[PDB]
Structure 1
Amino acid sequence: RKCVITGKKTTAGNNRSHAMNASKRTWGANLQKVRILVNGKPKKVYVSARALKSGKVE
């Protein structure tokens, strides 16, 4: 589960609430399963939104 174009994957980190508790948390990626012609043909794979805007064609 990562963007095929760039190395964008699910990262991890803490979740500091009031009193600075240290509950563990995960950070996802805003990626969608849209059609892109990464190869000679379209494949409908995951791709990051940040990379989708003004980037590779759909």
Structure 2
Amino acid sequence: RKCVITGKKTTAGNNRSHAMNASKRTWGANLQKVRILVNGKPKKVYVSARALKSGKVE
């Protein structure tokens, strides 16, 4: 899972409950599957929601 325009990728962190207990988790960006111009040719590549917010092509 990658994002083509921006360097968003799944990152690893640690969720902490009450009593401050620490365990390891992961953090996912809001990727979406959609049909995009990357070259002049249409393709379907992933894209983050923050990247799609900034008004790109379809």
Q: Deviations over 1:6-27 (max 9, x none)?
A: 1100001011100011110100
Note the C-alpha offset of 1:42: 1.1
Q: Which has the higher helix share?
A: 2
Q: Which runs of 4+ in 1 moved over 4 A?
A: none
Give the length in aligned residue pairs.
58
Cross-structure match for 2:47: 47
Please give the TM-score of this superposition, normalised by the length of structure 2. 0.92
Q: Deviations over 1:26-53 (max 9, x none)?
A: 0001011101101111111100011101
- Kindly report the root-mean-square deviation, in angstroms, between the aligned alpha carbons of the 2 structures: 0.9
* Distance in 1 of aligned mates of 2:54 and 2:18: 39
